[PDB]
Write a protein that binds this ligand. Structure first.
Ligand code: NA
Ligand code: NA
Lengths: 171, 173, 176
């Protein structure tokens, strides 16, 4: 059974928010994509690099998350430290992800180039930084998820199966 | 707050004395065309020496409060091209989107665009961007990336840059 | 510049230990470079196992002892744990050339969305350019077609040999 980590990074949501629209967008998108059974491991944390690092390490090392997706804290603002935390915990970066996510975003907004979203591997776990807006989250995942089930196969993880009328992963 | 913008021409030849710094001029001319808000250029010509480039950038960011610093020169595969190493050394986090788009923009016209090591990053609240050498390329490069720069500076709580929208339209979401 | 060009070709394979392994990738590289070049050059060719220390050694020998102006690798550039070619390349290079990885992934993403899984990179060690290529002969050729037009000029800038090409097949770009 596949375990997928979902991390909402936000001082605001950590302090208390009516709802977590970002985390929800990730869960709903994954539910739309996946016909195979999967289990979300979900945390809401503040913009604190040490905490983000700890959370990702726990998900990958102890909770066997084959994929971990983060949302928030990827811009130029002083407290946006999610990419740094990601780089800190991953041994092998995946530069193709950031490239594509920015390229797709750039079709809409020239500020796409301000995103420091990245991705990498910690051991057998893929970690991908997503943006904050639900619209953007779906657009982002639509672009990169088709490569993800195959990536997990190559890491000797669970075989993810998709609703091919919603998304078509290449293998 | 009154905006200060650093302009660094990196060049052994220029540092020894040349007729005119056309790359630096291209930067200042373009920024003049873009900007309606008042701003102060802080300009330095320095040699291709990594440590000197580092010191120059650190001063402009830390002491002179430059919200944007742009460099021209020293960004290819040649031994003495050390502007990107200097930029990476002084920045606390990189802005990979800039190197991507600047290469893509240059690649429109020259296959050797992929040899460019031009990059960008943040040192505290200062954005540092490595630009190309030729005036035509500098303008095309700025046309491509500058639309994102005023919003970047807004996010770093810096001065509000105001632009001539007939010339350039910065995006602010 | 007048000096005879040496180009390194490194095949990284989990079957390298077997003399009966048929290296179709290394062959595709050699064949491609022969199609491309009209100037005199010599291939320096090694098939090696996917052991990062060995890949590092091979690259360093080719760059530092055998005067290879260009070294191309094939194999070991995906997300699997055993794929350590980019780490070796990063280890031996003193500065990276991010434009190569961008272009190669872009040329590949034209065909497969798993293009973003490639960790192929490129860098300089001293005056030697090192570029990670893919595995399949078709992908190897497509890759080289995309990036090789910038390579002779790169070598010119590092004061290496002047490479000359068969312009019926590939046209290097050289600016002022
Ligand atoms: Na794991
Ligand atoms: Na060398």
């Amino acid at each position: 059974k596949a375990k997928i980590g979902i991390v909402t990074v936000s001082d605001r949501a950590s302090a208390g928010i009516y709802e977590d629209i970002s985390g929800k967008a990730i869960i709903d998108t994954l539910n739309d994509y996946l016909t195979s059974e999967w289990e979300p491991i979900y945390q809401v944390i503040p913009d604190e690099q040490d905490v983000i690092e700890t959370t990702l390490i726990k998900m990958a090392d102890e909770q066997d998350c084959c994929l971990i997706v983060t949302t928030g804290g990827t811009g130029p603002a002083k407290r946006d430290v999610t990419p740094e935390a990601t780089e800190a915990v991953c041994d092998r970066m995946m530069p193709g992800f950031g490239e594509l996510m920015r390229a797709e975003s750039l079709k809409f907004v020239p500020t796409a180039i301000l995103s420091r979203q990245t991705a990498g591997l910690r051991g057998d776990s893929l970690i991908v930084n997503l943006p904050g807006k639900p619209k953007s989250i779906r657009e982002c995942l639509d672009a990169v998820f088709p490569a993800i089930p195959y990536c997990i196969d190559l890491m000797e993880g669970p075989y993810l199966e998709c609703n091919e009328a919603v998304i078509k992963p290449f293998r």
